[PDB]
Amino acid sequence: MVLNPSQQLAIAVLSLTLGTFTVLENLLVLCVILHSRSLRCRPSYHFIGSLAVADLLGSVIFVYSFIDFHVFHRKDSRNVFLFKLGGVTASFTASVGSLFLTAIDRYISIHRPLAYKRIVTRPKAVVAFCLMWTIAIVIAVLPLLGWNCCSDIFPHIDETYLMFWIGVTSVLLLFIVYAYMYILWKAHSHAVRMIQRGTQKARMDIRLAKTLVLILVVLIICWGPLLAIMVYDVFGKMNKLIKTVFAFCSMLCLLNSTVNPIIYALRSKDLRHAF
Amino acid sequence: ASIAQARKLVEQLKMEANIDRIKVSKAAADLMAYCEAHAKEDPLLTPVPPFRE
Amino acid sequence: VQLVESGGGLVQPGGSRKLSCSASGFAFSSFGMHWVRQAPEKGLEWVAYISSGSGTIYYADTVKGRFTISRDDPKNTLFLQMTSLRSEDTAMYYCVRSIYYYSSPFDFWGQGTTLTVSSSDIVMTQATSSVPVTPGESVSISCRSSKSLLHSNGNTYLYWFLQRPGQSPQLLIYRNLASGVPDRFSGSGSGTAFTLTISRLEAEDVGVYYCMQHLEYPLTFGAGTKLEL
Amino acid sequence: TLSAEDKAAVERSKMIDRNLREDGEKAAREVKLLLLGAGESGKSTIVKQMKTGIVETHFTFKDLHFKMFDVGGQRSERKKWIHCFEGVTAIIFCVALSDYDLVNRMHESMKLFDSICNNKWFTDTSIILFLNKKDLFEEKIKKSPLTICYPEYAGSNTYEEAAAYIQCQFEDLNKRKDTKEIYTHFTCATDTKNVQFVFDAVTDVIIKNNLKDCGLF
Amino acid sequence: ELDQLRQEAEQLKNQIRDARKDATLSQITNNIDPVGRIQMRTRRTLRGHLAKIYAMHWGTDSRLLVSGKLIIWDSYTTNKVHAIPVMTCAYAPSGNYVACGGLDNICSIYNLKTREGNVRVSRELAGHTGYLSCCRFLDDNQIVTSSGDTTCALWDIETGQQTTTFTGTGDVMSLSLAPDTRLFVSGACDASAKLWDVREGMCRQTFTGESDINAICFFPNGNAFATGSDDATCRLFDLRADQELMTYSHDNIICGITSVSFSKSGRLLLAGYDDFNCNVWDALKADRAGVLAGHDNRVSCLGVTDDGMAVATGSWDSFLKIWN
Ligand SMILES: O=[N+]([O-])C[C@@H](c1ccco1)c1c(-c2ccccc2)[nH]c2ccccc12
Structure with a gap:
């Protein structure tokens, strides 16, 4: 029984408040972006919608995990627990994939500035849209169609699967940072070349740096302790301290669904002008 | 210079002053009668069942 | 051309x-x-x-x-x-x-x-076949379609190619009259009854006429007597 | 349920659609530039240096195709046909820079720049300013009556201060400092790098447009 | 000398204004049945243009349409009959020819029904110093064009030389032929409209109502017309009255009128505005009847069939919609 929040019970109310705030702000963003009048033209603005809906789904499902064991403790089948834990691994890898896709889009928008409008188009931006969701679904459901075990809250550890998932998400988490660093470098090089050539009146470089350092620090902070302790959990040894840090970092993990859509949908001036 | 241009203007207005005019009520009645006479076959006015789908 | x-x-x-x-x-x-x-x-x-x-x-x-x-x-x-x-x-x-x-x-x-x-087909028959052209009169051709050639598009298919003694045929009605010099040719249709009409004969008006019995992918409307003799 | 004729009358429409789609993508790889300078400032003298009504000119540079539209002798109201040029990448404005001594068509050039820069259709279209005629302007510095057209100006006889003052005066007419951006080159009659400047400017504006559409700006 | 001529012209103006100054149509039309609410829905959507379309013209048989490309349509079943590689369109009454002209200051005639199954230029009429605003086929052999040279022209197809020039300030923006093809009207940017005589070559009448006029169309009767200005006002003028009947304006719209057309029997006046939608006024009444919403940009062109079976509208987005 890994359930030992005995000295820390101030989770339910804060998690509920944070989830409600996330759901309401994501719904407001969707309302101001899903008018289907003019914002549908840009592929990146429907890339953002995928992240928003993934965040809303992760917020609504993740907080539901605790109320099931209050009064009746209905048994049903282990498949229910397995299929509810699988959902948590399918509403965050989808968000990470959406972030990777939008980072690749931004990288293309400067790597080949003249051919960006032709390389990236609506028919070619929807194949990856569905492909990433399907990949997330299948990687979540794979243990159900595979073999089982080294004991999580439900007996669903599969130590090999835990290593595989961390290795799969690591490539995306590294390529996002690489793409953003390359964007910053290319923008700075273009600005310094302009300055050296001599058309006075580096605003774009400074604006891009300010926009991107915040994104990078948020990404490296909110995904740092979780992955660190999950890779520490490699010899099968754990303590009440580890359980407490997981319980307290659950909210850090969930805080992405609150802060990331704010940053992504507020830094762009088109959404603000659309209102 | 400008005298010929002023002339070329002035022959225009003198000619137009001699055209006959009738009361606007008669023209309005004629237009209303024409509009009501052809009101039997007006697909945009009276929808009655080419472009059906 | x-x-x-x-x-x-x-x-x-x-x-x-x-x-x-x-x-x-x-x-x-x-x-x-x-x-x-x-x-x-x-x-x-x-x-x-x-x-x-x-x-x-x-x-x-x-x-x-x-x-x-x-x-x-x-x-x-x-x-x-x-x-x-x-x-x-x-x-x-x-x-x-x-x-x-x-x-x-x-x-x-x-x-x-x-x-x-070296050594689903439409067919028509009439008692009169290869009617000789009488000089100084008017010749008319009557034909009947086994099915209703009229389609819901409203475009009944009515072809009346004319073949003179020579090398190549001509078109008279493409569905009526095409972009041809003569005008006397006329075509009247009513359901399954069709009639080619000649206003007046001419030295180049003699020839063989071919019928229309086609609706589907195989346009086999060739059923028609040869009026060469 | 289609007829034998109509089934063959749909393939024609499909071929027409294919032809239009294939031809429509060859017009999206060309950049539109609009010449809008003063009539006698040297528009006819700048088209030949780079290489009835509207005249279209085609350039090639670094595997990039440029279309430049010269509205030379339309001689009509500008408010009735300026709608057609919405979406043009940039407007290349040319100024004589030696036409201040007519007393004055220099104020005419200033008024035209003010009218074009503050247009409602061109609220996001960049303007490339060419201050032309360095030869006569630099040769007349000995007895230049430049203070006549500029009562509030005091400066040295060197061309640098006067050129900077006049450039700042033209930049001062801009009211949209957030979207638009005026570029200057100080073109000469015997230059060779005129195409390089416009190429760099169009690359910069296209990169900024891509960034604005992407979401970073 | 010159002041005497100025006084002469001034007293001409005074006498004509006094002669044209009755009754009001808006008050005599009292006690009539309103149309109610008119809500025609879109029936066909036409794709293919990748641009802002600027002009169109219905066919003679009310089934074919014409819209750097010139597209022949099929309003019944959506098919592209032929595409030909501009501010004007014209479809010949016989259906043999089409016309196109724009900022190039020339108008081109294209022949449709030919051997070899191709469309090729038949005539390239030139002689204007300006931009063409409208073109209409008077006959199969005669065409009239109004441009920005403040003048109109009546041409001759077989020999490209101009037959007649009409002069008498500002750009002429629109053009409309009478049902009997014997009269002719044109509205200019000087806030004026003029009725001419094609046979004579001389102006017949002038009407002044203000801003530039960029839309005009004859009534089906042929004794009145409707104009649309840029001051968000539409007006109706009568040839036999030399006056203005009503203003088709509302306090909530401060948007100019881009195109104007009537319907058969002259009861519904359809005005394509620049406020992303068209409006359907009751030509005999001062109140709006219906709104044709569904376009995502400025509506440029508008047309109504000869039998009044469908209404085709186009806008600055490349989609041309056929409503019924
Ligand atoms: O049967 N399904 O495909 C249910 C699936 C779902 C989500 C949204 C729509 O279907 C679902 C999951 C889930 C699915 C696969 C792997 C891991 C978790 N976890 C869930 C938690 C709650 C609700 C549904 C799921």
Whole structure:
């Protein structure tokens, strides 16, 4: 029984408040972006919608995990627990994939500035849209169609699967940072070349740096302790301290669904002008 | 210079002053009668069942 | 404007040969191209139809899977590969062209080439066949369709190709009157009853007329008596 | 349920659609530039240096195709046909820079720049300013009455201060400092790098447009 | 000398204004049945243009349409009859020819029904110093054009030389032929409209109502017309009255009128505005009847069939919609 929040019970109310705030702000963003009048033209603005809906789904499902064991403790089948834990691994890898896709889009928008409008188009931006969701679904459901075990809250550890998932998400988490660093470098090089050539009146470089350092620090902070302790959990040894840090970092993990859509949908001036 | 241009203007207005005019009520009645006479076959006015789908 | 058909058929049984045709002064890349045959005593029946862009290669119901069509828009050349020639290939072949707007199909006909070998079909019959043309009078042709040629599009299909003693046929009604010098020709239709009418005869008005009995993919409207004699 | 004729009348429409789609993508790889300078400032003298009504000119540079539209002798109201040029990448404005001594068509050039820069259709279209005629302007510095047209100006006889003052005066007319951006080159009659400047400017504006569409700006 | 001529012209103006100054149509039309609510829905959507379309013209048989490309349509079943590689369109009454012209200051005539199954230029009429605003086929052999040279022209197709020039300030923006093809009207940017005589070559009448006029169309009767200005006002003028009947304006719209057309029997006046939608006024009444919403940009062109079976509208987005 890994359930030992005995000295820390101030989770339910804060998690509920944070989830409600996330759901309401994501719904407001969707309302101001899903008018289907003019914002549908840009592929990146429907890339953002995928992240928003993934965040809303992760917020609504993740907080539901605790109320099931209050009064009746209905048994049903282990498949229910397995299929509810699988959902948590399918509403965050989808968000990470959406972030990777939008980072690749931004990288293309400067790597080949003249051919960006032709390389990236609506028919070619929807194949990856569905492909990433399907990949997330299948990687979540794979243990159900595979073999089982080294004991999580439900007996669903599969130590090999835990290593595989961390290795799969690591490539995306590294390529996002690489793409953003390359964007910053290319923008700075273009600005310094302009300055050296001599058309006075580096605003774009400074604006891009300010926009991107915040994104990078948020990404490296909110995904740092979780992955660190999950890779520490490699010899099968754990303590009440580890359980407490997981319980307290659950909210850090969930805080992405609150802060990331704010940053992504507020830094762009088109959404603000659309209102 | 400008005298010929002023002339070329002035022959225009003198000619137009001699055209006959009738009361606007008669023209309005004629237009209303024409509009009501052809009101039997007006697909945009009276929808009655080419472009059906 | 001009269609030159080449390829003379004189082969032993069990052989194969090709029939070519070249077009001048066409937007050949945008014209559908048919192929029609006429036996010495028969009408004009399809053997193949080819659409613009090579997406429809409809063949003949009498012989299927043996003949094939090849097309060259840059070369403006349309030709036929024939396989397994039998004894009953002794006909005159023509390479008529057509185009469908939203307009007068079968407008131009080629010269045609001979073929001889050394040694769900609508059919009509009438008591009167090969009526001689009486000088100083008016001739009229009456015909009946087995089914209702009128389609829900409202465009009843009414073709009245005229073949004078000579080389190539003509078009009189493409569905009425086409872009031809004569005017006297008239065509009256009512359900399944059709009538070609001649206002007045002429020295070049004599010929053989062919009927319309086609709705579906095989346009075999060739049922018609030869009024040559 | 279609007829034999109509089934063959749909393939024609499909081929027409294919032709339009293939031809429509060859017009999206060309950059539109609009010449809108003064009539006698040297528009006819700048088209030949790079290489009835509207005249279209085609350039090639670094595997990039440029279309430049010269509305030379339209001689009509500008408010009735300026709608057609919405979406043009940039407007190349040319100024004589030696036409201040007519007393004055220099104020005419200033008024035209003010009218074009503050247009409602061109609220996001960059303007490339060419201050032309360095030869006569630099040769007349000995007895230049430049203070006549510029009562509030005091400066040295060197061309640098006067050129900077006049450039700042033209930049001062801009009211949209957030979207638009005026570029200057100080072109000469015997230059060779005129195409390089416009190429760099169009690359910069296209990169900024891509960034604005992407979401970073 | 010159002041005497100025006084002469001034007293001409005074006498004509006094002669044209009755009754009001808006008050005599009292006690009539309103149309109610008119809500025609879109029936066909036409794709293919990748641009802002600028002009169109219905066919003679009310089934064919014409819209750097010139597209022939099929309003019944959506098919592209032919595409031909501009501010004007014209479809000949016989259906043999089409016309196009724009900022190039020339108008081109294209022949449709020919041998070899191709469309080629038949005539390239030139002689204007300006931009063409409208072109209409008077006959199969005669065409009239109004441009920005403040003048109109009546041409001759067989020999490209101009037959007649009409002069008498500002750019002429619109053009409309009478049902009997014997009269002719044109509205200019000087806030004026003029009725001419094609046979004579001389102006017949002038009407002044203000801003530039960029839309005009004859009534089906042929004794009145409707104009649409840029001051968000539409007006109706009568040839036999030389006055203005009503203003088709509302306090909530401050958007100019881009195109104007009537319907058969002259009861519904359809005005394509620049406020992303068209409006359907009751030509005999001062109140709006219906709104044709569904366009995502400025509506440029508008047309109504000869039998009044469908209404085709186009806008600055490349989609041309056929409503019924
Ligand atoms: O049967 N399903 O495909 C249910 C699936 C779902 C989500 C949204 C729509 O279907 C679902 C999951 C889930 C699915 C696969 C792997 C891991 C978790 N976890 C869930 C938690 C709650 C609700 C549904 C799921």
